[model samples]
Target chain A: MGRQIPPDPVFGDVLVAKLINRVMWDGKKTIAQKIVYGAFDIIREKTKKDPLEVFRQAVENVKPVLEVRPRRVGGATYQVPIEVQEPRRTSLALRWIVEAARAKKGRPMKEKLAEEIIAAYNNTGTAIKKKEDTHRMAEANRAFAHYRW
Target chain B: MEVKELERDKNRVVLEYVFGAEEIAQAEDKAVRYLNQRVEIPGKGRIPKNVLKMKLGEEFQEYTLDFLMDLIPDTLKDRKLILSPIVTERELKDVTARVVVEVHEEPEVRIGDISKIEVEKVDEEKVLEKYVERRIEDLRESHALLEPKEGPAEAGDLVRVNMEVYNEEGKKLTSREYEYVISEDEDRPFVKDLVGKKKGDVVEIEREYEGKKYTYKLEVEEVYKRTLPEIGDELAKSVNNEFETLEQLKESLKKEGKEIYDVEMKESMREQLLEKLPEIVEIEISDRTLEILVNEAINRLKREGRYEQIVSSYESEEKFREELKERILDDIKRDRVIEVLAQEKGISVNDEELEKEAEELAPFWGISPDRAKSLVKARQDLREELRWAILKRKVLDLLLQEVKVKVVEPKG
Candidate 1:
């Protein structure tokens, strides 16, 4: 179904659909959907602004510019530079945002996910840090750029 | 001016602007006029403006950029292109210049109750005495002398010898004249046997290593002893020409020791205070402000290149990222918390303090004091960094005095 996932009804965005897909667990799409809608409502209640805009802002800030992909050339393995483009960039950002929200302990997924979204919207959070760290690795990966296939 | 938005990020934006042919020509005219006032052609008094562009158009272009960037704040303020931008990137082309900058803001923080925080203070005069004992030993060792000894090898003596080792099969393994210093700490099986044996005294020894039994023949050739002159005026002066007497050296070292004690005490308190911050406040630092801090940790490892070498030392990249992310957050919290508390107390740093700090830092910078002072004075960002540095120290000092104290129990 993810081959070309349909957009979410509220936001009418395939990106939102992708975020929900990343948040879902064990075929529990309804639970994931409830958590996200709740998070968006929390965003709206706090900022008194559109949650969709905040969601987009989170995606933009949390997305990485570069990343490392391992390539084996003859004998040795190299973590070579790979420029992240639009589709994969958004996917990775969405995945990272949801993962961090899930990773934090004790908090409800809805509350944690909402906090993460706001943090990213302000360019502050683990998801953005993941992007920084990945970008840094990609910078070091430039030394092995010659191995790129 | 023609404006174009190039790129925008959380911290910075890149914008480009162009000057048309006529505007560019006018800027060059002013640039030429400005240059003619500053420089002269050796023995020839003046270089003409018409000739100036042909000879030094690069400098002319730079002046033109200076004029444009000078107008940038006022330009933006007038037209509302962007609000209150700070310029950092200075990329320029034939008739175009770029605006690369960010909007500055005071960090938002929720500071928790800090008076409840308890910090440990070390009684460092005792620490200083221990330091003095170690320092004297180090200095004495620095002036160590080696001389020929009359007796058999004793502890702290250099013993010269000849040795040959062979396996049970009678195959010769290693045969060489070796110089083995009889160290007091040597725990080898034969080191006990080798001592109290004189020169030309041939002694055969047997040992086993890694499942191979081997035989060793030893012929003692010569024994030497190393000595240190008693710590006095002579020892102190030679270690560094600056000290004329042992007392003088001790006095100087005490001052140095005092600084170390101050640093340690401050560092301990700083960490204790910062440790309390998470419990007191929730700080959300933008990634824009933290990239430098993250790379500061990575760059030390970057200097000792190789990814696997760095990553493995960190246990793994995943582990390292978690550590770095936490450290970055801590640093941000440390900064903003200090700022908020300092403001709460109405504390601020002034120019005199900045001047004093620059002068104090000059010795470590390996630059002349005047150069150090001017280098900071010339840079707005560098000056601000120093101001915060002094501000943090002062505020931390006050907080240390105000906070509840607990003395750490000394280990026996």
Candidate 2:
């Protein structure tokens, strides 16, 4: 059976719940859940905007359109261009957004996460930049587009 | 001076004429218009356009029409041209007019035509039944399992064993326990050796791998009979929640199978038509066009870093080009014929249909419609290629309406 993920307590969305689960560190789900909710709370207090909406915008902005895959033909490997599927696209965006937030220093994880999310929603963050780089790589390798299997 | 004809032929001609200020001015004006540059004639020996342009006088240089023809004959061959250079020498002093230009147009030759195609009607239902059977077999495999049974090992029996591998030097390489089923057609030489061996038996087998003899010791722990459950409501529910009964599952399988079968049949039909086209269709592909196609193929291979390897695989660049030329020519002809036929039949695709189709295909890729569309848009050629593909499919479907297809039993 394809079991559906339970929605998050605050946003009541499976994607948000999935994000909280991804934010979990060292199998401490309660701690991970606290940090995610705390980050959302900070987002609400600072901008007086819906945290879920900002998160959605950030995820949408960081989603990549194209990616390069290695395809070997006659002992020669080609960087074949391909479109990213939605599930992988969203998961990558979530992972990158979290990673970019975690890479910064001198601030609480919640604050850094909130800042990164806001920056991504505005389309000016490391996560968005990573998406651009992926797209550019795919574009450069587009001559092998026909090699898509 | 008057024009004097020296030689004449179907494709080439030589003539003599006087060149002066009037002729230079006229030729300059016409050449400038044709070349989209300014022209200036100097009273001297022939000057190359490349050097004249570098000096920054005028974009055009004085030259006989015969020279110009010689310079660009490859570009203008197989066509008729009327070169009317209105020369006016009194306006500016220039070279004399002693050269003549003769424009020759070869008569047109039609190479290919596909006026009518005989399409055979196919038994769509029978074509789809084969898919249903295959799907059911797949379903059966997915539901098969093994249950413990008391028996000496036999063919089709599942065996659980602790196995250890050793090299010829008697040093243990690895040891692990795993379950395997005995099947005659599989590449399981060691598993096949377990036949007639009962539980608690220590089996020893030797085989050569990578030119080295290796020994395996298997301690059989358990035996089980492989079984597939009966297809009914319970099995149906376990496969998917959407299926409540065996009949529902079979019905859904047939429907989905038909969808996939239709797409497959369409592709096969298209290939058949393309293969049969040369017999009925007469089309001429010019050398220049074929060269462009060859260059495009070479450029693609180079871009993918496969050019050298592919050339080496073909033994050399010469052989590669020879093989590629015919294949590229065949594809070009097929595409050209399909394009012309589609146009003549007024077959066209719209963005709405494209979007709808993308959405329909999204589930196959496990993506959303927007994602699929964006994926298609990422590559510039994807959209147009998809449109052409869809249009060709429609054209083939239309042809199928008039086809008489034989109902052959699908081969397993």
Candidate 3:
């Protein structure tokens, strides 16, 4: 009751709950749940591995650690590197994974989602690339680290 | 009868062709006779057309005139004859006809003469000298050396205070350090209270915020006084690399000051010119044109993802339109008036000039020259807008050339 996500019906996993919500279009939660579950089934059949475990590893791999924050100092703004919080990391990871899945053309949603998840678990694909790019940006702005305070 | 040729060109010819009513009546009779002679109907027997007792009025005259024109002497082949109607009282039907023909000509127009414009001048040298001296003083103050002071804070000293605020429940709120220059006027009682307070001295102050009183405990952390440095070549060179000597510094500063004054003077002159324009000419923009301009502007805003802010600023769609209506109308009118004036004055920009302007403006917009030109060419409205902008600037420049500018020293 205090703003907690219930586990997804088919998978009984909290990660799938978030995934289904992200996949939801036009307030059709049931359809999103169907697509997400169907995607997991495809993942399991393709890899001969547990779908939930693969998804968890993918989310973990895509989560960013350091990100730049705009800190104003002496009339100028500096992009100072800061450690991203836990909640924000998961959210960013989930968003990138889903966005990457949706951006590819000609593939069914379930198949695309399954392929992206497997690729992310192996530290490849658009989601992982995005994470690397963010890390690179933070590293480049390392000189402004003192401006964070 | 002699026909005199007035004007003859490839596209058209003007002439004075004279004919008598006898000639027309004869042509009409011959036209009916010719029609009666034509026979063909295959299975149906051909009947002779009635040539006699035919009604002869404007209609009958018009029908037979074609045949008569072809049969007339010296008639040009494959040429059209534009003739006026006959207004007869059934009496003067046999009178000689005088016809004057003319081809259309383009009307001549002259844009207004903008040969002279009256402008006031400014005295530049004296103003720059004064401006440079003032800037030097400001630079010395800002970059002055800070020295620690042991005594209680004075009006001119810089004081650092550690402040902590607490709510009514004694829960700590905001705790922060703030540096304040002890000024008697701006800081008021706060600085006055801190004037006699030394370092490590704590003072409790109560302030009301949002109908709730909060207590602030202030502890003076540090106090310092500024030591002004001597103005010389050494000081000038330390502050700026371009200054090798004090005289050189003053020279550069004076040049900079003159540049600033010129920019400001040009801006004011443009404003004055805009004000003087109503007396010169008034622009009238139609409602349909304004509507199209607004639609184009709104479409651009939408494409840029900025229309939502405009929409949210007003109560309704009508209200939003009303809010922005005046601004849009003013813009449209200004651009249109400038275009009209430019055209009338025979002012024009060729492709090279436009391309050069696009190149110059492209960097400011962070776009490539090709991209800028394509954007300008994309919309008819945008093309006119950009062309008007260039023309307006050119007109302003031309107007400025006629003026005598003198820079007066700014007041302290």
Candidate 4:
């Protein structure tokens, strides 16, 4: 699950590079770059705004601050809510954002990526729903907050 | 959630409920206990509180309202009676739930007095003579005498041929002694080729089927000309062991023909009842209830993998659904007719009656009486269907005994 590549050619940004890296199948970074850049081009033409800004805010909007991890204590395990690290939060958001786009059938990847990003930027989408649901879970089990230790 | 009664119709009822802060306060505790056991993540305690709480957020609120909806049965447990009660509508907003139930109950209607009933006759005019004539004609054809001939076979001649089919590879296949009648309208392609061919003459017929080519080799073994039988008492004894003369045979056939008329008459009566009952009885089917039944039928058909096959025949899914609704409407109408009739007659089907009925049907079904009963019991639909059939027979039998039937003919 641990992997990466150099900075994306056009943007020289590692974030987009990491996204391109994740999007590719069997190291076809050439097509992967086209898909990611094509979506960005779409976002630019449609929104008449910079792609990087939208990508940044979309990922940021999607990132969940509070998540829960399981802790084993006494013979039984307990669900203990925790403060999710910034890096892991950003990664999970990207994963699901692409994964959610991939979830739908018929439409190609570039348009789906653009849709996911635009929806995330607008603070709406399955990615945002996932964030809200996670927060609710954190609140729902607020009773078990004592197990955080 | 507490109750509020709405429209209480003759056989239908609707109710509403509202669960407030205190209800949620109580719901939360119930949700937690329920979730702790159900949502437990095996090796991991209930998935992280974040995820579990995410689940609890919905599942807790969702089921608590569901738990509260159980009040209908308890409410009915205190009331008069309820049968096949189905919730027509359900709304849940902040646990202010609205439930509309069609508490299906027996409709009150008078079973008309059994003064006299007229059953119509089917138009099989002179059926006994027609039936006997056909029987005699068949026997005459069967008694046709075949005289062996030496010349080439002609139309209406019987030819016995040794036929063999072979693949294109010339791999020899089945060779059998086949007999045929040379007729104007022929189904077997090679049979026509056999005409005008004499004894020991060999003919090879070639044909292409689909994409594969094959050939039939026919060896004409013998040809014979047919002679029609002379109708007499001799032909009557040939009909069967019980017949002494042609008159006796014709009489037996006439007897059998009357049974067909009897069956047709009974079916005519059944049609009369179904047609008449709709005009006499008023069982207004609720649209929402009908919709629920239609959806269930579609879902079941989908589960059984026949939905796509059925729907594809129609122009669109909307058309298909409409067609389905119409069929279901008629079906439910007939169902209501039967149910109401049984109720009127005080006819009931218990296990004893069902067992007896199963025994009667076992031979028809070609199974052991025990197996027949077990199979019927195994399927919920089959049990009720068989029960309905038994009740129908009982009710109709009772009606038949009580009423006087007058056979009537329609005007020309």
Candidate 5:
């Protein structure tokens, strides 16, 4: 991890780039890094777990297995569903769940993120449900794969 | 006589000529002559000199008095025949023509708005008769050319040129601007004739175009051919694509050009559809709702790091707002339609399905299934976003069901 990855400004790991991106507020990278650090401190205090582990766990939990893509056929674009790759599932989960957590009103960022993380751990939160729903769409759209190939 | 102009809401009426009777007479004569030249006239074989002398006895003298009273032969149906002698200064006032143009009142002044009053029709009727007779004379002048075709104007007929051309305002000469959409079939030949001519050049050329000889009699106002970038391999390389030569790229591009054109056409059609909807339904969106929805969309774009991308090109916040307004309205309506569809069909994503999705997703992300669960729990934001995505799709599916989207093929 240390050989090729640069340490984050605040999180002290290259994965912090992903974390900072997730925590980004108003596209302000500096502010997002600060928020990620703040949330990491909160994670450490609440879970009595390594904050990096907590971050890693949060990312792992949110990944989606399948996604739907719109394929243009004839003159129309049909939304033919497809399976997600490893990198995509990770990235999509991280970006999306972080966004949903940030949208919660009246709660501090750290606590909202913590709530989302816990929900994902229990496999009951919106992100996990979203992943499931996407799979269902993929299943329903399996017939359309013939059109794609 | 003093002229009076009554300008009303829709039309401007000219009450008087503000000209003496002599001036009016001259103007009227000129106008009638112009019209006579304009009317489609045909030729009749000359009568024998003996026949003309025997039957037209004193017809030349009686023509001035009997011009309006006499019924001319079936020379041209509903067209007056020329008197035996035309252009006689003595009987110049014998045959005059009439024109009464009307103007109607309206908010916008258009072609049908104006009302033209009719003044006295003096001796121009005699001038018209003279024109008829003079046209009939068949002057054996040395420079006469035989026109091969018939029916008023043929492919190579020399229509007599009228020096005095008047605009709608009756001004001596004024340029008129018009727009033309070129049809694919006719445009090819029309473009060939249109090439290489400049403004003020009168064009008289006949070319066999699409198997029909078309004689284009146009006073060339303006002509310029469209110049495009040179197509070659160098150009293809510039567009960040792999092509050894320009021709190779161009051939490929031509094959795919229809796809690009179809996409553009579809977008245009969609815009037209939306415009038509506004016309039909009078969609009155509340300013407050529009503002919130617009702001939400902007915020989402900003979140996605696309706000600057949109703003930089559109350049102004207001322009972006206008563009976003239409898109946002469409999105909202589409969402609503889909939501209705979902409700009608009863679609739901249950807990087991959600867990199954997570199980499937974790391995793809290079994490243990348990770790993936922990990741979702750790990131509440992704959880919410996922839920929203599911709901949105449900809504979309609903819309897909209800909307009668007529899907067309690429070439079709």
Candidate 6:
């Protein structure tokens, strides 16, 4: 059988589906999808900048390099922090970057999103910083790589 | 409204007094000894247990050398030995309780010519009201068409497509055809999508555009098949409600429900976003945003009977307004960002969906679904807030796809 994909009208792709899923609540994907795409579109038009470029830059900029994992050693699961792969790292980075950008109040969501994207692209925003910090943590815990599969 | 120069307020030293564990243990021992001596067996026994409990005076005291040693010293030194003599327990409690009291310095409220502040007040009340009103109006006008318009696609594509549109009152808002062009390729899918189809036969399609590894939706409404469920008895029966039919319930419930959910969601999202958005989006807020925030904060303080504290807080620190401004500005920008996205994405609650949402809430609030809808529309600001909520959630969802999030403690 084909995968149970989200048949979101506004956003059709699975990536969008995943985004809506990320935003989905109570199994309601429509509203989430609308907001996500709305933000992307709003940011692009407001800044007179490329929305995707901003997204890419934002995502790329915010991609975190490290994340802590819960490792079960005997009875206790230590936060066996690990380094994030480039792919996963960027994914996490975008999540944080966009949220952080969206968090600001002064500018419109689009402008804030554009700013966040650009900031993330430059590796300067909290999203990027979070990525760097995550990587730093993972690097610090590299000695515990034996905990990995 | 006086434009006072940025005068330096008295610096407040917020200090804490914690006794060393060893010293505290010793002080307790001394207190125990002192109490032991003060209690004469027969005389103390005469006091009833319950009455003693009620008449218990300042019994907990910290005296003796060790108790004195725990007192924070006057002069600056490596280890602050307790310099003051240990008095009654009441005294010790009093001193320690005063740990965080402000260190008073000379008062200095430099008075200067006050045109700036007056102008600011006039301007803020005037400009801010205008700004807020303008934004509110923009937000309302924005949702008229619930379809995303495609913008520029390629580097050589025409970037601008201007059109003349009218408001509900048939007033021409944009009546001239404007030429636009997008010279470069950016990740702005919304703009790229809308470049050609300003006014075309595209039923603002809301679908995700697939890319190499990730995807995002392109939403725009053009004149096309505007398909939506009918609001009538059929719908009511479909949901198993008390309404005779969907059609009967729909007229009263549909738009009203949409409006209510829109407002509730918008306000909820704004509050949540405002609380958390500032730490991420590092944008300089316009000065106007700061002023509105200060006034709002002050007003809240007044409403909560904390205006005196607010004044004192300002007296203690010049950065009070700055702090409030920081918080407020962050929130304002976040709102703008969210609003922009909503416009671009064509995200909205249609009649049927709204009715459903209202149906859910109507029972909870003890109102008919239709009445709930009216209640939402009646409070336009509140309704718009819900719209903001819906948009914010959407942004969050999209970002979640691109980022890796793990719950970790915030670092100090």
Write down the lDDT that model 4 would get: 0.67
Residue B316 displacement (Å), model 1? 12
* Residue-wise C-alpha lDDT for candidate 4, range B339-386, written one tens digit per residue: 766766677999888878767756544346787667667657557756
Q: Judging by TM-score against the true structure, name the best candidate.
A: 4
Quality class of the docking in candidate 6, CAPRI style? incorrect
Clashes of each: 0, 28, 8, 3, 43, 94
lDDT of each: 0.68, 0.63, 0.63, 0.67, 0.46, 0.44
**Candidate 2's residue-wise lDDT over B1-412, tens digit each?**
4455565553334445554656555665455455444444552334544555456554235433533333334534564432222122212234654544543322122324333554332456664566565667678767776788888787778888989998987999999998777775444656766776788888888989789999899888899888877666777886878888887888898888667556645554554555445455444444544554588678886774446544654456886687678665555555555666677788888877876666665554434568768866676665665577678767766655554454544322
TM-score of chain A of 6: 0.63
Model 2: per-residue Cα lDDT over A1-149, one tens digit each = 11378897777767678778777774568787888988899888755767886687567668776777767898966777788754677788888988877754213577667767866755555567678765644554556788888
In candidate 4 chain A, where is summed lDDT lowest over 10 consecutive residues? Answer: A99-108
Weakest lDDT window of 10 consecutive positions for candidate 1 chain B: B75-84
TM-score of every candidate relative to the true structure? 0.39, 0.47, 0.42, 0.55, 0.27, 0.25
lDDT of 6 by residue, B1-412 (tens): 0111122223222233444335554665665555555644433323333332234454444243335444544422452211222222222442233222222221212212211111000121232333443433443333222233354233433423334444443454443333333435433434545544444422122223353222232333232211233433444564455768534544334444444434433333333333344344444333433464477566776663444533552334456566456545554545555554455667665545544554555553434677657755665653554445555667644433333222222111
C-alpha RMSD in Å of predicted model 5 compared with the true structure: 43.9
The residue ranges of model 5 lying beyond 4 angstroms of the native Cα positions read: A1-5, A10-12, B1-412
Worst 10 residues of 6 chain B by lDDT: B113-122
Candidate DockQ scores, in order: 0.02, 0.01, 0.01, 0.01, 0.01, 0.04
Kindly report the docking quality category of candidate 2.
Answer: incorrect
After superposing candidate 4 on the true structure, give the runs of residues whose Cα lies further than 4 Å from its correct spot: A1-149, B1-4, B8-12, B17-67, B77-120, B123-125, B166-171, B184-188, B208-213, B259-280, B294-327, B350-353, B356-369, B393-412
Best by DockQ: 6
Off by over 4 Å in 6: A1-17, A75-79, A86-91, A98-112, B1-412
Give every collision pair in model 4: A137-B53, A137-B54, A138-B50
Question: In the order shown, what is each candidate's alpha-carbon RMSD?
Answer: 19.8, 23.5, 27.3, 25.6, 43.9, 23.2
Say which prediction, candidate 5 or candidate 6, comes out ahead on DockQ. 6
List per-model TM-scores for chain B. Answer: 0.48, 0.57, 0.53, 0.70, 0.27, 0.29
